[PDB]
């Protein structure tokens, strides 16, 4: 996260840290005691599927304070429409091997209904993005969880107020832009998979997933987030299904 602040401990209780062989991989969002939403692209280079760990209640990576809860990831479910090495349909649904225990420091973010998300949440201007990602473009990652308030843009407006670079990916109906084009504030590498959380009438909801961008907080560019509302029905159906052998599962989309 570039140009944000430290998320006070316990104020981002749905934030997940994903690790592979103990190393920082990506973020994620807890949506109930056993399911985590992340980005499909976080899994493009995984060979050690058995060494994938989700950590809940994390805040400061340098100390263990007893609020952390680690769980093995039993399954990673990706839409059939996602193509490795590309940006479209950048979503993954992760089943934890054992549920996390809800506490003051571990709380799920609400996965909203599609209609509510498209009709109401999509028009809430500001939302929070968070992660232990790079603090600067080509810079060090954060030891404490960071958070940033970003405004959402209509895709027509994002394309119009964006500087053309060439070979830049298209912004599809499965994405949205959020952030600032003045090079000050954005999510960054390492924040991928983390939540874009929207407040509405006293409750927070999952509306986006940190997905991609062209350099962190670069002038004329915004952060691009997976448009979660497109996947509600897909996610709900999978959460009602029995686990299948093998960690990776490609599930038809829609």
């Amino acid at each position: 996260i570039v140009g944000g602040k430290v998320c006070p401990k316990g104020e981002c209780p749905w934030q997940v840290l994903l690790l592979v062989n103990g190393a920082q991989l990506c973020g994620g969002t807890l949506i109930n005691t056993i399911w985590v939403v992340s980005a499909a692209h976080c899994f493009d280079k995984i060979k050690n599927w058995r060494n994938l760990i989700a950590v809940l209640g994390e805040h400061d990576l340098s100390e263990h304070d007893g609020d952390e809860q680690s769980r093995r990831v039993a399954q990673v479910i990706i839409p059939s429409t996602y193509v490795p090495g590309t940006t479209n349909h950048d979503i993954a649904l992760l089943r934890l091997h054992q549920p996390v225990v809800l506490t003051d420091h571990v709380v799920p973010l609400c996965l909203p209904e599609r209609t509510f998300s498209e009709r109401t949440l999509a028009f809430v201007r500001f939302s929070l993005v968070s992660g232990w990602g790079q603090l600067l473009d080509r810079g060090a990652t954060a030891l404490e969880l960071m958070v940033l308030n970003v405004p959402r843009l209509m895709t027509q407006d994002c394309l119009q107020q964006s500087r053309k670079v060439g070979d830049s990916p298209n912004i599809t109906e499965y994405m949205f832009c959020a952030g600032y084009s003045d090079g000050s504030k954005d999510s960054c590498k390492g924040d991928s998979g983390g939540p874009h959380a929207t407040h509405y009438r006293g409750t927070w909801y999952l509306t986006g997933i940190v997905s991609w961008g062209q350099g962190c907080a670069t002038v004329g560019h915004f952060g691009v987030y997976t448009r979660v509302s497109q996947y509600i029905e897909w996610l709900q159906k999978l959460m009602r299904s029995e686990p299948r052998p093998g960690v990776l599962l490609r599930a038809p989309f829609p």
Binding site: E11, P13, W14, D104, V107, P112, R119, G202, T203
Partner: protein, 55 residues
Amino acid sequence: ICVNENGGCEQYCSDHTGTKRSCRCHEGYSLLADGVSCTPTVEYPCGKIPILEKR
């Protein structure tokens, strides 16, 4: 009705035949008698921050 101001619902809104609307809540919440508000039924409802709620 649901299209305009979330039909007055705090959370989810369902349109019915004619001028009929039903508000609903996420799991871990129940709908109040006002027919619009959602109240937690569990200790850790989704999308609420305990250290801020307890303040």
